[PDB]
């Protein structure tokens, strides 16, 4: 029948045996993180192993991992794993694939660009300051705050507004029906028993395309692609430096233009990249901040001196907070929430050495990697100075891989980095955060397959009066 599970080790390819039709994945209890981390302290450079019938192989050298990444992203690894059942989803950049990717790509890089960046920037530090009003009230208040549901309040403000122009205030407004359809749009957990299903049965994705059942649930993505051309008309042509109005600008004048449908799976799919990845990161580098307050002050005492007397964060006076950036990459470091990086091999190829069969998914366990002893000094420490100017090339772009790399890295990367540090730097601009004993210590990490924390952060905060 199917013939999968003997393929690595025929190939000469360590790793965990496999069981009949699940592979590798009971030994996913531990979390994607604590298995990849587990898998190169015992079989070293490459191992192999399987999500069920399908053959995973896992690289750690930096200049195959570049070659992966950017030598050969065209020719032989252009795509990510499929998934799950996607419907029309299957437009959207980031799932789709070879040609229509390379197209989307190219369609959409120039809504990126660093020009656009500065031009957005007063639309989300407008949201910088609204957080700071919603964050008064919790701290003066006495009681702790979650830091999920006040950034998840401020990545949605800010998603909001740079994609549609919508000006919301998310969290004194929860039932806004624009914004209670959006937050169903949360991170997906491949550990999930669904998902988990999904990989043991791909023969079954065909069937759950066929029922219209979809990954992306139907009533949000039915809720937003209406509204989307409700608004992508009149309202729009009474006549934005938004998401939605640049794509609009790039329908109308090389390949194909921007469909109005493959326009709305963006939209979409830049808010599922971007509102709990970035409400996530906050709150671990808004953890570490308050366990560390050796950092804390530091960043904002920087903050003053860019800022003084609380002015207002521009473009050029954040990529000049270089302790900030400090702060940012360090946790970035220890939580890389993507936590792997995949491609799949279109053909056979041979890279640096090894012979990759096409069909191999090759992923890349960044988590692990920057956990690394051999490129990290102290791994499990939170460290910004190891990314102080100088002392910080000696560390491997290819190892450190928090956006991922080569011309399929993260599009959102200068944005998502800017929109943090506006964040950070008009919060710390105000308050100081400190622990709670509900202020789990030592932090740890979901079991599961979102990296997240155990328990959600609650932290103790403070006017700077
Ligand atoms: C802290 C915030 C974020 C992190 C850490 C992050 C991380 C990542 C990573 C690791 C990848 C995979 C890249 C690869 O496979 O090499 C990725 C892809 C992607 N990200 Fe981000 N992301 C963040 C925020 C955002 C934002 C704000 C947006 C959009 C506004 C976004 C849009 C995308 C898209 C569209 C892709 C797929 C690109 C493609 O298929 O060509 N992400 N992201
Ligand atoms: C947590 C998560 O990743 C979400 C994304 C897709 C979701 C699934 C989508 C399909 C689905 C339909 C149902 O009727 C039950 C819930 C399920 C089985 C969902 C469970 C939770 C999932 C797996």
């Not at 950017?70 to 020719?75: A, I, N, P, T």
């Not at 229509?100 to 639309?123: D, H, Q």
């Amino acid at each position: 029948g199917t013939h999968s599970h003997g393929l690595f080790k025929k190939l000469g390819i360590p790793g965990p045996t496999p069981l009949p039709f699940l592979g590798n994945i009971l030994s996913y209890h531990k979390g994607f993180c604590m298995f990849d981390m587990e898998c190169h302290k015992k079989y070293g450079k490459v191992w192999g192993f399987y999500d069920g019938q399908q053959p995973v192989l896992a690289i750690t050298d930096p200049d195959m991992i570049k070659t992966v990444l950017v030598k050969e992203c065209y020719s032989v690894f252009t795509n990510r794993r499929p998934f799950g059942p996607v419907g029309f989803m299957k437009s959207a950049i980031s799932i789709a694939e070879d040609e229509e990717w390379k197209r989307l790509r190219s369609l959409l890089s120039p809504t990126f660009t660093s020009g656009k960046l500065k031009e957005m920037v007063p639309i989300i530090a407008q949201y910088g300051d609204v957080l700071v009003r919603n964050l008064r009230r919790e701290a003066e208040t006495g009681k702790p705050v979650t830091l999920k549901d006040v950034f998840g309040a401020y990545s949605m403000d800010v998603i909001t507004s740079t994609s549609f122009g919508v000006n919301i205030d998310s969290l004194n407004n929860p039932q806004d029906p624009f914004v209670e359809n959006t937050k169903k749009l949360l991170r997906f957990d491949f550990l999930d028993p669904f998902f988990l299903s999904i990989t043991v049965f791909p023969f079954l994705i065909p069937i759950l395309e066929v029922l219209n059942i979809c990954v992306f649930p139907r009533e949000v993505t039915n809720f937003l692609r209406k509204s989307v051309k409700r608004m992508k008309e009149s309202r729009l042509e009474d006549t934005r430096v938004d998401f939605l109005q640049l794509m609009i600008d790039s329908q109308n004048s090389s390949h194909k233009a921007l469909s109005d449908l493959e326009l709305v799976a963006q939209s979409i799919i830049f808010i599922f990249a971007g509102y709990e990845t970035t409400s996530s990161v906050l709150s671990f580098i808004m953890y570490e901040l308050a366990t560390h307050p050796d950092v804390q002050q530091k960043l904002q005492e920087e903050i003053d001196a860019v800022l003084p007397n609380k002015a207002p964060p521009t473009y050029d006076t954040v990529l000049q907070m270089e302790y900030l950036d400090m702060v940012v990459n360090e946790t970035l470091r220890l939580f890389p929430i993507a936590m792997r990086l995949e491609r799949v091999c279109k053909k056979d190829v041979e890279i640096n050495g090894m012979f990759i069969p096409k069909g191999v998914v090759v992923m890349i366990p960044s988590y692990a990697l920057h956990r690394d002893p051999k490129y990290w000094t102290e791994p499990e420490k939170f460290l910004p100075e190891r990314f102080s100017k100088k002392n910080k090339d000696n560390i491997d772009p290819y190892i450190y891989t928090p956006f991922g790399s080569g011309p399929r890295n993260c599009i959102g990367m200068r944005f998502a980095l800017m929109n943090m540090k506006l964040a950070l730097i008009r919060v710390l601009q105000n308050f100081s955060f400190k622990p709670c004993k509900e202020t789990q210590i030592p932090l740890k990490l979901s079991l599961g397959g979102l990296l997240q924390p155990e328990k959600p952060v609650v932290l103790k905060v403070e006017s700077r009066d």
